[PDB]
Amino acid sequence: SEKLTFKTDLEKLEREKAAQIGVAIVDPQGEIVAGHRMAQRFAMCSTFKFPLAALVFERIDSGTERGDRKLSYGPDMIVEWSPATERFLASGHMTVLEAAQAAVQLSDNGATNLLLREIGGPAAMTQYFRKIGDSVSRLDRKEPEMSDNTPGDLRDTTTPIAMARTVAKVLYGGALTSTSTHTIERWLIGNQTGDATLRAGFPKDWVVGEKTGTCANGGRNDIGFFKAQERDYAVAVYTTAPKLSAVERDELVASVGQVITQLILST
Ligand SMILES: *[B]([O])([O])C1=[C]C2=C([C]=[C]C([C][N])=[C]2)S1
């Protein structure tokens, strides 16, 4: 019955906001807690930056990368929304960890593209999804074109259920060392771009960390984890709402946060 409320309340938002909403919540093992259009494909947008940081941390864990390695670049690497990358441009480099932190916490596009260059590009990000058991998520392009979200285009897509299970595998499923898992959790909680999204719809004692995405054509997404009353959850929310303003798209994702919260409190 709380499941029907969840479904009805999301359908109400979809209808009233002219939006498509895809949600999946899974427990630490990836078992479904709730879902809504959970297997519809949505553009990842900047949400992939969290799995990208996980890939980088695993390479550091494995001794094939080091967090202090300096990555050289020029003005050619500055694309739209590259605030850290632009600050570090005169110095000529960012370290692997500086780039990862800017990618995760500021959504910096140039820092993300720097890491894609070092790992061998989109194909390598896709191979990491496959390695961790995700047969759906795919990165095809670098930023910002991967955020085009052209209707019908399956490049650069995931599904809510695949990405929620990828989050659960990274945080609870032993993809990373204990150290690296704790760090990436800490980075997600300290994300600077999510204050108006899912977090704005959750209780203030839940421990939440997330990565936002914004795409052209009205996409607004948020994926991450929350700890609610001694239970851990992974969540992925993908929305498309081309007729909403940017503020209204944040509000929609906060409202999906509140519908999630009502389901969780019911169980
Ligand atoms: B992320 O993939 O969600 C983003 C892509 C862009 C962001 C900000 C600005 C631009 C402009 N090209 C793209 S966030």
Q: The domain spanning residue 175 has which CATH number?
A: 3.40.710.10
Instruction: Count how many domains the chain has.
Output: 1
Candidates 47, 49, 105, 107: which one to mutate for ligand 1, based on the most atoms within 8 Å of Cβ? Answer: 107
Quick check: helix, strand or coil at residue 163? helix
In one-letter notation, the amino acid at residue 47 is T
Q: How far apart are CA 172 and CA 231, in angstroms?
A: 12
Q: Which residues contact 225 (CB under 8 A, 6 or more apart)?
A: 167, 168, 171, 185, 188, 208, 209, 210, 232, 233, 234, 235
- The residue segments making up the domain with residue 226 are 1-267
Resolution value in angstroms: 1.4
Q: Is 81 in the pocket of ligand 1 (CB under 6 A)?
A: yes
Q: How far apart are CA 121 and CA 175, in angstroms?
A: 21
Please name the method used to determine this structure.
X-ray
Q: How far apart are CA 238 and CA 23, in angstroms?
A: 7
* Strand partners of residue 71: 94
Q: What are phi and psi of 257, to 5 degrees?
A: -55, -45
Q: Is 219 in the pocket of ligand 1 (CB under 6 A)?
A: no
Please compute Rg for the chain using Cα positions.
17
Annotated catalytic residue 255: no
Q: Is 183 in the pocket of ligand 1 (CB under 6 A)?
A: no
Q: How far apart are CA 198 and CA 78, in angstroms?
A: 29
Q: Which residues contact 17 (CB under 8 A, 6 or more apart)?
A: 241, 243, 244, 248, 252
Instruction: Find out whether 138 and 156 touch, Cβ atoms under 8 Å.
Output: yes
Closest CA to 109 of 87, 80, 88, 138: 80
Peptide bond into 144 cis (omega under 30): yes
Quick check: helix, strand or coil at residue 264? helix
Instruction: Find out whether 13 and 262 touch, Cβ atoms under 8 Å.
Output: no
Closest CA to 249 of 95, 77, 18, 1: 18
Token code pair at residue 85: 């990358």
Q: How far is the CA of 216 from the centre of ligand 1 (A)?
A: 8
Token code pair at residue 260: 């999630």
Q: Where are the alpha helices (DSSP H) in the chain?
A: 2-17, 49-61, 83-88, 96-105, 109-119, 122-131, 160-171, 178-189, 246-266
- What are the b/e assignments for 141-180, b being 16+ CB within 10 Å? ebbbebbbbeeeeeebbbbbbbbbbbbbbbbbbebbeeeb
Instruction: Find out whether 122 and 139 touch, Cβ atoms under 8 Å.
Output: yes
Closest-CA residue, ligand 1 atom 8, reads 81
Closest-CA residue, ligand 1 atom 12, reads 80
Closest-CA residue, ligand 1 atom 13, reads 144
Instruction: Find out whether 172 and 235 touch, Cβ atoms under 8 Å.
Output: no
Q: Which residues contact 39 (CB under 8 A, 6 or more apart)?
A: 159, 160, 161
Candidates 109, 223, 249: which one to mutate for ligand 1, based on the most atoms within 8 Å of Cβ? Answer: 109
